[PDB]
């Protein structure tokens, strides 16, 4: 049903806000990043789009660049500059005292157009030209080659997000919700998993937590909610990343460390009482439906 020239799109602002309906007065459901490819499902004045995690939501028409399959594939083939710092800006000139073009957040990706001084020349999906510092970003080839995707590397990135505010449906370094924290940290390591905590709970290996937590490893996810009964199936309401020694990092009010041990000052009584199970998912990236890297994700590739 979508015309051929607008069946695809690329986000062209640092962070766009996908909503339940095509209006600002509807709840935000997730967020997409600068340079991210999307499928365009419908147009009503707003676009209904589908992100590479298969999540759907609505955005204002001015935040995405609609494209033909040919132009979309061309965008995806071009080597990117990947933003690696949480926050920064792009500039009109290779000088950070020059006029800015936009803010950027980690995970943003722009087309690499060249180099001048300490900057990379970049272009936006809409056609804007800018310069970005080599100290906050790096070429996609270089970045992919040095990428670490182990539990220790992912936990190191999670600690750089401590104190960042909680934001319902937040999916960027600007602000995150419980499942959005997991997604933001993983995207900085080129990984995509399902958006909702209820869907993250059923990917990877389910771990039945031992009373002393001896079978839970660093990098496992911990899930919270309503325990299953004979009459009702379990309900997932929250998620965190396990750090070992009965501690976990999560987003609640802000990103912070909590504990299942009442000796710890950061003991979280409410969530300890609602702990259901853990999941081991990092060994199964690109080995199970819904868990992949962007160079294995069909939204980023011709098909």
202's contact among Cl ion, its own copies, none, with CB below 5 to 8 A by partner kind, is none
Q: What are phi and psi of 143, to 5 degrees?
A: -65, -50
Per CB under 5 A, does 17 bind Cl ion?
yes
Tell which positions 94-113 bind its own copies, by CB under 8 A: 99-103
> Could you count the other beta carbons within 10 Å of the beta carbon of residue 87?
14
Burial pattern 212-249, b for ≥16 Cβ within 10 A else e, equals: ebeebebbbbbbbbeeeeeeeeeebebbbbbbeebbbb
Binding footprint of its own copies, residue count (CB under 8 A): 38
Cβ proximity to its own copies, 258 vs 294, nearer residue: 258
Using rule CB under 5 A, residue 237 touches Cl ion: yes
Helices 178-187 + 151-159 axis angle, to 10: 120
Indicate the residue among 157 and 297 with the shorter CB distance to its own copies.
Answer: 157
Sign of CA dihedral 136, 139, 144, 146: negative
Residue 176, strand partner residues? 166, 171
Q: Near its own copies by CB under 8 A, which window of 60-68, 69-77, 133-141, 272-280?
A: 60-68
Closer to Cl ion by CB, 112 or 166: give it: 166
Q: Which is nearer to its own copies, 102 or 297 (CB)?
A: 102
Report the nearest approach of Cl ion to the CB of residue 269 (Å): 11
**Binds its own copies by CB under 8 A, chosen from 253, 265, 289, 303:** 253
| Among 5, 24, 134, 302, contact with its own copies (rule: CB under 8 A) | 24
Nearest alpha-carbon partner for 60 in 2, 107, 108, 9:
9
The set of catalytic residues is 178, 238, 250
Breaks (C-N over 2.5 A) in the chain follow: none
What CA–CA distances, in Å, run from 3 to 6, 10, 41, 66, 133? 6, 16, 10, 10, 38
Query: Which residue among 18, 49, 63, 243 contacts its own copies (CB under 8 A)?
Result: 63
Q: Kindly state the DSSP code that residue 240 receives in the 8-state scheme.
A: E
Question: Of residues 114, 168, 227, 235, which one binds Cl ion by CB under 5 A?
Answer: 168
Residues that bind its own copies (CB under 8 A): 13-17, 24-28, 60, 62-63, 86-90, 99-103, 159-160, 162-168, 173-175, 252-254
């Amino acid at each position: 049903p979508m015309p051929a020239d607008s069946a695809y799109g690329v986000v062209h602002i640092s962070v766009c806000n996908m909503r339940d309906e095509g209006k600002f007065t509807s709840g935000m459901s997730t967020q997409a990043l600068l340079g991210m490819p999307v499928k365009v499902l419908q147009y009503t004045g707003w676009y209904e789009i589908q992100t590479p995690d298969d999540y759907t939501g609505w955005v204002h028409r001015m935040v995405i660049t609609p494209m033909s399959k040919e132009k979309y594939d061309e965008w995806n083939r071009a080597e990117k500059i990947v933003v690696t710092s949480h926050y920064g800006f792009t500039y009109e000139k290779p000088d950070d005292d020059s006029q800015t073009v936009s803010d950027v957040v980690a995970g943003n990706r722009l087309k690499w157009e060249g180099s001048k001084g300490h900057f990379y020349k970049v272009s936006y999906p809409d056609g804007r030209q800018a310069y970005i510092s080599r100290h906050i970003s790096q070429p996609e080839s270089k970045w992919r080659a040095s990428l670490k995707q182990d539990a220790e590397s992912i936990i190191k990135t999670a600690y750089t997000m401590i104190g960042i505010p909680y934001l319902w449906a937040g999916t960027s370094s600007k602000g995150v919700d419980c499942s959005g924290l997991v997604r933001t940290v993983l995207f900085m390591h080129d990984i995509i998993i399902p958006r909702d905590a209820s869907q993250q709970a059923y990917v990877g290996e389910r771990i039945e937590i031992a009373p002393d937590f001896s079978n839970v490893q660093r990098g496992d996810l911990v899930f919270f909610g309503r325990k299953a009964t004979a009459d009702r199936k379990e309900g997932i309401s929250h998620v965190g990343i396990y750090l070992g020694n009965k501690r976990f990092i999560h987003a609640l009010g802000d990103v912070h460390i909590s504990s299942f041990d009442p000796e710890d000052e950061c003991y979280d009584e409410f969530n300890t009482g609602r702990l259901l199970f853990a999941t081991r998912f990092l060994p199964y990236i690109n080995k199970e439906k819904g868990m992949n890297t962007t160079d294995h994700n069909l939204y980023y590739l011709h098909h």
